[PDB]
Amino acid sequence: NFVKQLSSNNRKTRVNALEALKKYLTAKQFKENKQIEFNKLWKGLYYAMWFSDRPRPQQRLANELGELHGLYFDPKDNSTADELTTNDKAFIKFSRGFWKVMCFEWFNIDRYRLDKYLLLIRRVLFSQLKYLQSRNWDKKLVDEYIKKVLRWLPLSGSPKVYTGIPIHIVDILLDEWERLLKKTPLDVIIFQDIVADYNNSKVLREKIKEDLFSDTR
């Protein structure tokens, strides 16, 4: 099992597990399984990242792990005029598993390892909004992706999800968006509904009002 190998203490085996998984990810006609397999794979990747601490190499591991999101059926099929090509669904499931694993293990990260996971989240969010279509210029797929994103991270209605991840997402949203290099489908600014709707964490509402909206961009 990849998850068992990805969490292996030995560094060589851990790296080889990811190297082999680079192909298992693109192994077609096998990602149709339920989201539980994606959740298990991302749980294994969580420990795989956990086993790296040094700044320079951990950044390399984080970026190569974030590239896994784009590894899924790179934008070479030219699936224009298709609501779902059966490949973007795999990417959506992968992102959902990533967010579920990160949300569940948010408080299991020590103080020193928190920066590593913040960097990993930043890299994953960069790979997202970079690989939906060729880039984030697809309404028919952004509506599905935003629906599967709006319902978990920015919900702010269920206190089960910690408010730190939404705060980091708010902080890095505009920073990462400018990296893509415009009139992009930015329905994303969800935050208006969060501010309008009560019952949410007042800290989150204040942070988004003071920082996100106040931004000149």
Binding site: F107, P159, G164, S201, K202
Partner: protein, 131 residues
């Protein structure tokens, strides 16, 4: 005049420092109340039954308000229609934990509540009967 707790538990001491830090750096009365209650002895911290929590939930806007119990939550066999709510307490009995989880609710610790409500956002404090 209560300043510090007599309990030797390390986890209780960590919770006490967290609550003191929140109270001193937030000036929110909710944190002060819980910090003061943490120093109360076992007798002064009677358990709060799950039936008592369900009865307290009958007030308006209970779904949007979480319930916080300084003491320990004990199961009750006289009630079965337990609503879905988040309960935070130092300890949860096996029966009470099963009842809360079975009814779709979630049980969390004091630190989880503090991170979810640094200033007591929609937090309800229940005190068990003294005698």
């Amino acid at each position: 005049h209560r300043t510090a707790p007599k309990s030797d538990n390390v986890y209780l001491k960590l919770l006490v420092k967290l609550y003191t830090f929140l109270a001193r750096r937030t000036d929110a009365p909710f944190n002060k109340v819980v910090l003061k209650a943490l120093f109360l002895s076992k007798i002064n911290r009677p358990p709060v039954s799950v039936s008592r929590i369900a009865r307290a939930l009958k007030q308006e806007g209970a779904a949007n308000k979480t319930v916080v119990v300084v003491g320990t939550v004990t199961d009750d066999a006289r009630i079965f229609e337990f609503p879905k709510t988040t309960v935070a307490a130092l300890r949860f009995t096996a029966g009470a934990r099963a009842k809360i989880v079975k009814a779709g609710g979630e049980c969390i610790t004091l630190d989880q509540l503090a991170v979810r409500a640094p200033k007591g956002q929609n937090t309800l404090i229940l005190r068990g009967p003294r005698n």
